[PDB]
DNA sequence: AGGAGGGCGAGGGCGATGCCACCTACGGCAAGCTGACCCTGAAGTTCATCTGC
């Protein structure tokens, strides 16, 4: 299949994760779990239940990269000492990629909830 | 000769066997170095080589 066609992704998906990555190991999301750089972004948010999405304008928005804070500060509350016994229910995916030479070893992937992680 | 050789019951009673404090002071528990070399890549082309012409 040489290279690329082993894994036949289109160009508008191969684009989409590719600038995916590229945003999330340049954005906030990128932390180190420990020695291994991850990215973490919320999964779809549930419908953001009504009354709450009274409040909320438009309503609610499904910003991918929102409660990441959830699961970074999950791994900071190991140094904070921080660390709260959390109730999930919102899974954050967490690809804690790292780099082999020049390929990307997924050494983490966590669709699951903080709780979970 | 035939003797009798103690019989009795006591042999502690009373309390005390410690009092007092002290059982540590001081400071140091590290210094200094290293915690790794090396490679192993994608991607592409070249280049040497092979098959077929």
Not at 51 to 72: E, T, Y
Not at 78 to 90: A, R, V
Not at 105 to 115: C, G, I, K, L, P
Request: glycine letters at 10%; one cysteine or more; charged letters at 20%.
């Amino acid at each position: 299949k040489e290279q690329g066609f082993a894994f036949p992704i289109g160009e508008q998906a191969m684009f989409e994760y590719t600038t995916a990555l590229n945003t999330l190991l340049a954005g906030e999301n990128r932390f180190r779990i420990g020695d291994v750089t991850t990215v973490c972004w919320g999964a779809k948010r549930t419908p953001l239940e009504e009354s709450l999405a009274s409040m909320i304008n438009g309503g609610g928005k499904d910003n991918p990269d929102a409660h990441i804070d959830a699961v970074k500060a999950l791994y900071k509350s190991l140094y904070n000492g921080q660390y709260c016994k959390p109730d999930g229910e919102d899974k954050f995916y967490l690809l804690g990629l790292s780099p082999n030479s020049a390929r990307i070893v997924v050494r983490f992937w966590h669709e699951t909830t903080v709780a979970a992680l």
